[PDB]
Amino acid sequence: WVCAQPSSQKATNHNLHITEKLEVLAKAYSVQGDKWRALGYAKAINALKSFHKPVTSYQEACSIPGIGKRMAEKIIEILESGHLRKLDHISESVPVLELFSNIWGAGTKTAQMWYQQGFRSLEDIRSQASLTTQQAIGLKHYSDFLERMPREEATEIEQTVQKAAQAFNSGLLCVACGSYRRGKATCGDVDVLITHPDGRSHRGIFSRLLDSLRQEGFLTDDLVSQEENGQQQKYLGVCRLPGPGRRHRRLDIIVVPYSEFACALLYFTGSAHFNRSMRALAKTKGMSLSEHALSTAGRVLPTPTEKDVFRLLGLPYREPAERDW
DNA sequence: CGGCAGTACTG
DNA sequence: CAGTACT
DNA sequence: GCCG
Ligand SMILES: [Cl-]
Ligand SMILES: [Cl-]
Ligand SMILES: [Mg+2]
Ligand code: NA
Ligand code: NA
Ligand code: NA
Predict the structure, then answer these.
(1) For the domain A261-322, what is the CATH code?
(2) A149: which of A65, A90, A153, A189 fits an S-S bond (Cβ 3.0–4.6 Å)?
(3) Measuring from the CA of residue A41 to each C1', which nucleotide is nearest?
(4) Where does the protein end up?
């Protein structure tokens, strides 16, 4: 279980020559839609990174959880010949599929459809493809959404959101989560979690917050924002700080009731692989973990803090920086 | 043999 | 619903 | 792809 171990184990990858090759294959399977095969590769790559020494034999490889016969056969090939033959036999569509699936709002199904229809470049997409509203925004920001920002900029973005929220309710609590909270030097987007310790005033805040942030020109486009019925849980969109030298940045906001704060903080801090491992562990123990609660397979268990979730799952606590799986 | 996380929008 | 998205 |  990855969630039972510190992610600092990957700080020194004694198997980088193997993992750099498997990562190419994992991405090729992923963009072609074979998500489960790609997941198996992702987990094997993480196991190889965290392993304490270079892998040198077939029996050694199989002893690692996440590495089976077929993955072991690939390891010994790399060790004996320095090359992996399958990398020379990837489907020729893969580079274009990767290009297309990096449009926000397009996944494997859309990329494969565009490829089938004869498109091969973003010029083809721009001029000839049918784009959803979201995908047209993704394309307009194609380069910017592949950039990571310095964490100092993420601080500025969180503070912009926080100042706007607290301007109409000074008791609101705002926390930047994701890779920022895990201590990374750069961040792909800014994840802001908002709650209120009174357990009630979090309701009806999205409408005022978003209009405030629109009034000052901070939000430049919206991707996901269900503002019609008042039950909105998340906002996914695009922002840009004022002044020269600023790029458009992805911004994700969730508003949660205080009773769900610890589970929401755990979820939104990630990493994604950390969450999937913790949720899988919960299932083996007759429980279920979501952004809303830790439950039995059910009864909601009391989790006032992140530490309580770890404890109820029988896991030693990990600080956010040690969840970077 | 079948799961592989669990959830929130969009149209 | 399927697709894509969040961590 | 891996695992129970
Ligand atoms: Cl969730
Ligand atoms: Cl906490
Ligand atoms: Mg985000
Ligand atoms: Na290691
Ligand atoms: Na194994
Ligand atoms: Na995409």
Answers:
(1) 3.30.210.10
(2) A153
(3) D1
(4) Nucleus; Chromosome
